[PDB]
Amino acid sequence: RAGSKADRPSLQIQTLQHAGTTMITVPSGGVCDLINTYARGSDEGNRHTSETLTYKIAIDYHFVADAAACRYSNTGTGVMWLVYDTTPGGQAPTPQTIFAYPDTLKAWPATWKVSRELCHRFVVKRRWLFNMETDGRIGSDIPPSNASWKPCKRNIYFHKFTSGLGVRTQWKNVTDGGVGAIQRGALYMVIAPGNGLTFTAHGQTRLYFKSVGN
Amino acid sequence: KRAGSKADRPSLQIQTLQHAGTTMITVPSGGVCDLINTYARGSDEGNRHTSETLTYKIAIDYHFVADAAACRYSNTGTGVMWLVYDTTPGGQAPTPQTIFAYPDTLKAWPATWKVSRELCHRFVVKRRWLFNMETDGRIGSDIPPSNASWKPCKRNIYFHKFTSGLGVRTQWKNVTDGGVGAIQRGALYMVIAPGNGLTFTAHGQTRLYFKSVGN
Amino acid sequence: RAGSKADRPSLQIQTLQHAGTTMITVPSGGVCDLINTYARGSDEGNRHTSETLTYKIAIDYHFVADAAACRYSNTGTGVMWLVYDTTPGGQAPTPQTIFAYPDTLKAWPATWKVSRELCHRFVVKRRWLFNMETDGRIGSDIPPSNASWKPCKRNIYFHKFTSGLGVRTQWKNVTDGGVGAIQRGALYMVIAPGNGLTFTAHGQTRLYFKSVGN
DNA sequence: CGAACCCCA
DNA sequence: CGAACCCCA
DNA sequence: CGAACCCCA
DNA sequence: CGAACCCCA
C-alpha cells in the first residue's frame, strides 16, 4: 500500500474533467494527450517550485461505441498505454511517431511495439487491455414484439489505480502549465481503438504529487 | 471466529429493517438517499438505552428487478451502492446531488462519481459495491411464440453482502425519537444509484448489530 | 519559554487595529466577532498553505462608559469569552445562539453557560471578568467650588497574555480571509456588558501563528 | 533575565 | 467450525 | 517495481 | 488495514 512518500503531510491533488462539450473522441489510429499539466501560482491545484514528483494516479471512465461504428457488427480490442518522455520537444508527438508501425498494421494496435530508434527516449511504464463488441444495433430503438436481444458489452466501465510509478519533472521559467513549458520528464496517455471501431469516453482522473526544490 | 466486532461476549442487539409490500425501495434516475441507523429509545429489545451507541456488523439481502417502464428498451448498465458516514448531520436530509457534485452531463453514469472536494472532511465512504443488470426488452409475464425462444440472462439478480470491519460512534440528543433530527453526530446512509436510464425496484431486509453504552 | 513551538525561527504576526472610526461598541446583549482572519498571499501577515496553528494571543484595550449610561449611577460586571468553533457555518453566529439564556437573564451575563444541545460544537477555552461603575457624572464638566468627587473606576485598562491555547484550522480554496472561507476551527471573541451598562473600546491585539501543510 | 518574536550579562 | 448473536464434535 | 534489454522512487 | 489524502474501532 505505501509506495508513496508524503506520509504525515497530505499530497496535492490535480484533477482533470472530461465530459460534456469536452469528451475524448478516438478516431482510427489513436490520439495523444498530456495529463501532467500544472499551472504555477497560489492555488492548491497549482505548483510552487520548478520541480515536482508524481506518485499515484487513478482513472475512471465510461466507454461507449459510436453510432457510425454501430452500423457493422464486429468485435475488437483496444489498448491504453501510459508513456514517459525523457526529452520533450516543441512539436506535440503523434502515435505514428512514438510507435513505428507499417501501415498494414494500422488496424490492430495490440501488436505495436515501441520504435527501436527511439528506444532511449520513450518508455512505457504501464499497459492495459480492453475489448468491446457491437451487435449492429443502437440502443435508442425499440425491438419488435417478436424477438429480443442480449447486448453483452455494448459499453464498459474501466478503472485502474496504480501507486508504483514515479516521475521527476523540471519546469522552465514561464508560469504557464502547457506542453512548451516542460524541460524534462513529460507524461502521456495514449488511447488506440480496435479494428475499425471508434468510440468516445466520459469520466475524470486524479494525480497525486508534491512540489519540491529551491 | 473471524470477528472484528469487539463485543460479543454477551449477545449484541439486533435492529431489523423490513422493505417489502407497500414499502419497497424504488429508485428513480439520479439516486435516492436513506438513513438506516434509526434507533428508538425505550424498553424494547430493538430500542436503545443510553445516548451513545456503537455499530459493528451489517448484513444486506435484496432482490432487484427491472421496471416495466425500462423493460421497453434493450440496453445494459451498471449500478452502485455506497455506504456513507456523515460526521456533522444537519436538519435538512441530504440528497445525492449534495454529497457528490456531478456536472449534469454525468448524471447518466454513477460509477464515475467521486465525493465532492469541498465536503472532503464531512462525508466519507466506508464501503462501495458494484452490480450490473441487463434487459432484453421483454417483460417476463408474456408467452413466447411457438417459433422461437429466448435466453434471459440476468433479468433480475440477488445481492448480498456481509461486512464486520466497520465501526461507528453516534451520540443522540435528548428526545426519545429515533428520527434523523435526533442525531447529534455520526449518521449513516445507504445510497443507491441506477445504471444509465435503467430504473428498478427492490425487496428484502437488513440487519444491524450494536450495543448501547454510556451514562 | 513553553507553549509556542516556533523557537528556531520567528513566528508570523497578524495584528488587528480597533480605533478611530472603527471601535468596538457593545449594545446590551453582547456582540460577536472573528479574530482569526488570515488573507492568503505573499505578504508576511498573510498565510501560505491551507493549514495554520495559532499559539499565543495578546490583548490590550481601554474601556470607557457611554454618555447614555452615564445618566444613571449603578455598578455592574462584564465578561469576555474566547470561544472555539469546531464546525463553522455560513451564517455568522450571535450570542443568543451560542448561549441559550431565557430572556429574563439577559441583564446579567456572568450567569450564562454554554447551551447543552451544542455541547460538542462550541467550547470556551478562556473566560475573564471585569467590573465598572459610574457615579452618574460625565468627565467633561467642571465641579462647583463647593464640593469634589472621587471617581473610582470610571474607565479601566484591560490586558491579558495567554500562551497555553492551541488551535488547528483548515481553509478552503478561496484566497479570501473572511468567515466563509474557513472549513474548520474558527475562533471568536465575545464581549458582554454588565446590567444596562453599555460602553466602547479602543486598543489592538496580536496573534502568533505559523503556516503548515501541502 | 524581561517582555512578548525580540533580545544577552 | 458454519452462519451470522446463534451454536458444539 | 513494470514491461520486456529498458528503466528508478 | 477500507478506499483512495481521507479516516479509526
From Swiss-Prot, chains A, C:
Pfam families: Gemini_coat. Gene3D superfamilies: 2.60.120.20. The keyword DNA-binding applies. Keywords: Capsid protein, DNA-binding, Host nucleus, T=1 icosahedral capsid protein, Viral penetration into host nucleus, Virion, Virus entry into host cell. GO terms for molecular function: DNA binding; structural molecule activity. Homomultimer. Interacts with the movement protein. Binds to single-stranded and double-stranded viral DNA. Encapsidates the viral genome into characteristic twinned ('geminate') particles. Binds the genomic viral ssDNA and shuttles it into and out of the cell nucleus. Plays a role in protection of the genome from degradation, virus acquisition and transmission by insect vectors, infectivity, and systemic movement. The CP of monopartite geminiviruses is absolutely essential for virus movement. This is Capsid protein.
UniProtKB/Swiss-Prot annotation, chain B:
The keyword DNA-binding applies. The keyword DNA-binding applies. GO terms for cellular component: host cell; host cell nucleus; T=1 icosahedral viral capsid. One of its GO terms (molecular function) is structural molecule activity. It comes from the Viruses. Keywords: Capsid protein, DNA-binding, Host nucleus, T=1 icosahedral capsid protein, Viral penetration into host nucleus, Virion, Virus entry into host cell. It is found in: Virion; Host nucleus. GO terms for biological process: symbiont entry into host cell; viral penetration into host nucleus. Encapsidates the viral genome into characteristic twinned ('geminate') particles. Binds the genomic viral ssDNA and shuttles it into and out of the cell nucleus. Plays a role in protection of the genome from degradation, virus acquisition and transmission by insect vectors, infectivity, and systemic movement. The CP of monopartite geminiviruses is absolutely essential for virus movement. Homomultimer. Interacts with the movement protein. Binds to single-stranded and double-stranded viral DNA. Belongs to the geminiviridae capsid protein family. This is Capsid protein. It comes from Maize streak virus genotype A (isolate Nigeria) (MSV).
